[PDB]
Amino acid sequence: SFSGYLKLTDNVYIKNADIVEEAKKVKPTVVVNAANVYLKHGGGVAGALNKATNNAMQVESDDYIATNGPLKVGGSCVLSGHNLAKHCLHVVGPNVNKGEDIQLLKSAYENFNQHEVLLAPLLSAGIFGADPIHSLRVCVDTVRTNVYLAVFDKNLYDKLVSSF
Ligand SMILES: O=C(O)[C@H](CC1CC1)Nc1ncnc2[nH]ccc12
């Protein structure tokens, strides 16, 4: 049910869209969240996804952290997708604004390989501070499963496609 995506490689597709609106439209099996190790969904994609679940994603995440402790940078956990998807794969990319190692971005994308198809944002882009052109390159060179990338910013989408 994904539509209006531009094909980049055999398995990677991209579209200028709000991932929350895309998730409500498609109801994918897996939506990826650009999480931090604490699953504190304050801003960016995480804040937007959480707000669409009426804060149910934050309640569930806090119970997960209380039981298991924080995730590793480069790591992930599968939780409920609530009203947006069957599951939400919370993936932690490196936040270069917090001094985290950019080499962990490839480890972050490797988490996508455990799922046949995913709706996702560019990891470590936005307020995580990494170069989005670099993040898209790591994605197509690491992910082997079917990934549908939603890029919110129009000007960034245009730059990604024209420079790919
Ligand atoms: O549009 C995106 O998908 C990303 C992540 C954002 C949606 C959470 N935005 C950006 N990423 C990197 N640099 C940027 N400069 C201006 C916008 C921008």
CATH code at position 51: 3.40.220.10
- State the closest ligand 1 atom to the C-alpha of 132, by its place in the atom list counted from 1: 12
DSSP symbol at 71: P
User: Which residues partner with 91 through β-bridges?
Assistant: 34, 76
Residue 152 falls within a domain, yes or no? yes
Residues 6+ positions from 49 with CB-CB distance below 8 Å: 19, 20, 23, 31, 33, 41, 57, 84, 88
* Solving technique: X-ray
- The two tokens of residue 154 are 């129009």
What tokens were used for 87? Answer: 């599951």
CB-based contacts of 35, cutoff 8 Å, min separation 6: 41, 46, 71, 76, 90, 91, 92
Q: Taking CB atoms and a 6 Å cutoff, what residues make up the pocket around ligand 1? A: 44-45, 121-122, 125-126, 132, 151-153, 156
Closest CA to 14 of 139, 142, 112, 111: 139
Q: Three-state DSSP class for 106?
A: helix
Alpha-carbon distance of 132 to 64, in angstroms, equals 29
Q: What burial letters (b/e) apply to 18-41, b meaning 16+ CB within 10 Å?
A: ebbebbeebebebbbbbbbbebbb
Coil, strand or helix at 150:
strand
Resolution in A: 1.4
- Residue 125 belongs to a domain: yes
Q: Atom 5 in ligand 1: which residue has the minimum CA distance?
A: 126
Q: Which atom of ligand 1 is nearest to the CA of 45?
A: 8
Segments forming the whole domain that contains residue 97: 6-161
Residue found under tokens 């932690």: 92
Task: Please indicate, yes or no, if residue 1 is contained in any of the structural domains.
Answer: no
Evaluate whether 35 touches 46 at the Cβ level (below 8 Å). yes
Alpha helices in the chain, H assignment, sequence order: 19-26, 44-52, 56-68, 104-110, 132-142, 154-163
C-alpha 124/C-alpha 58 separation (Å) is 20
- DSSP code, position 74: T
- 3-state DSSP assignment of residue 68: helix
Strands lying side by side in the sheet with 30-34: 6-7, 12-16, 146-151, 117-120, 30-34, 87-91, 76-80
Q: How many CB atoms lie within 10 A of CB 75?
A: 17
Query: Do residues 47 and 19 touch, judged by C-beta distance below 8 A?
Result: no
Q: Rounded distance, CA 124 to CA 33, Å?
A: 11
Instruction: Give helix 56-68 / helix 44-52 axis angle, nearest 10°.
Output: 120
As for how many domains the chain has, the answer is 1
| CA dist., res. 15 & res. 38, Å (int) | 29
> How many C-beta atoms lie closer than 10 Å to residue 51's C-beta?
13
Q: Which atom of ligand 1 approaches the CA of 130 most closely?
A: 12
Residue 148 Cα to ligand 1 midpoint, Å, equals 16
DSSP string, 27-66: --SEEEEE--TT----SHHHHHHHHHTTTHHHHHHHHHHH
3-class secondary structure, 83: coil
